[PDB]
Amino acid sequence: MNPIILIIILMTVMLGTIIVMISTHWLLIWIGFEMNMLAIIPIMMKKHNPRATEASTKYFLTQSTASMLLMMAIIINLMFSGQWTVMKLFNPMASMLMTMALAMKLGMAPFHFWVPEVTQGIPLSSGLILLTWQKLAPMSVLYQILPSINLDLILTLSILSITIGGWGGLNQTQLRKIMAYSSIAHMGWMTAVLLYNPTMTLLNLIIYIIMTSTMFTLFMANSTTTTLSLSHTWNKAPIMTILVLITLLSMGGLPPLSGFMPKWMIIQEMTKNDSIILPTLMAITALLNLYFYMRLTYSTALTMFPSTNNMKMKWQFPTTKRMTLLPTMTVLSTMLLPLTPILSILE
């Protein structure tokens, strides 16, 4: 792609999400989501192969259906409120339709059926854009309509996402589908604590964006998209195996790492509201995520899968890749737990 056009398309993706974030009118919310979708479609088709066309078709149909449900929720809000302020909705039908729309846009289960498909079909950079930057605009709108979100609906979506994203990553050897089912589970974590304390939802969003950006930057730096290709990293650059070790142990929620920070705080905000069974099921379900994380750390760091002879050529060439903010994101994704009370800046 022409890099001027790449800059304009990425600035238009950012412009769509910022128009969702800053606007006080529902039509401008919908315009921002349409602009975000319309600009992110060629980022998925950067390489022009049939898997990118398939992934882009599936993504376009899911996001178009979600935008239809969003605009019907907006028109029903216009009927039952006569206005357009981005705030709570004045009808549980519009509340349900906008919650379904935002659950489809996040790819939360049982609308999860596009996230591993689309994430497998596209490159790692567009997968990073999809799994981090597109998780900001619907979470903004969910943060803005929480006086009208049905409790049972968003908790059903949350724990169904946590369970299905936990089970999905266990049957995987492709790293992009692993990160996609990890995304399903973690969006379930974020939306579970939405009606209890949305500051913890923002904290989980930021820590998950840091850890996901760390893992995709490590994957792009290693030029690996499968488990068995990532397993040759010890023979090429052994520090990257240490970084994926500490980052996948962070994403599993093990202390003393910062990925234990959101989850624990979510439990800290759900036992206050006298819900003990639900974060217990959430925590026990997170062991599935930790299991396929430990599978990747066994295949990469803690053992040594056999390499080839041609690896001896790649010993002679260092990495000329723009590993943008990789040590900063690695330190933020692993050693941030003693700074856990920083979350009050997100209030």
């Binding site: 390489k47 192969n49 049939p50 898997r51 990118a52 497998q120 079909g121 490159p123 266990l170 049957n171 050897t173 492709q174 998209t225 499968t226």
Partner: protein
């Protein structure tokens, strides 16, 4: 974990680029025939048009 369903699933390619499976485009065969004001009375152009 291979099952009965997950047994025909070959692993995906390395550069994520699939061979094009070159199904025939089937060019539309016009019969620019003899009864025509342009073909001068007696001329049967069997042409193949891509549109």
């Amino acid at each position: 974990y291979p099952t009965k369903e997950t047994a025909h699933w070959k692993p995906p390619p390395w550069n994520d680029v699939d061979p094009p499976k070159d199904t025939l485009v089937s060019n539309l065969t016009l019969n620019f025939g003899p009864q025509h004001p342009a073909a001068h009375g007696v001329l049967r152009l069997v042409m193949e048009l891509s549109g």
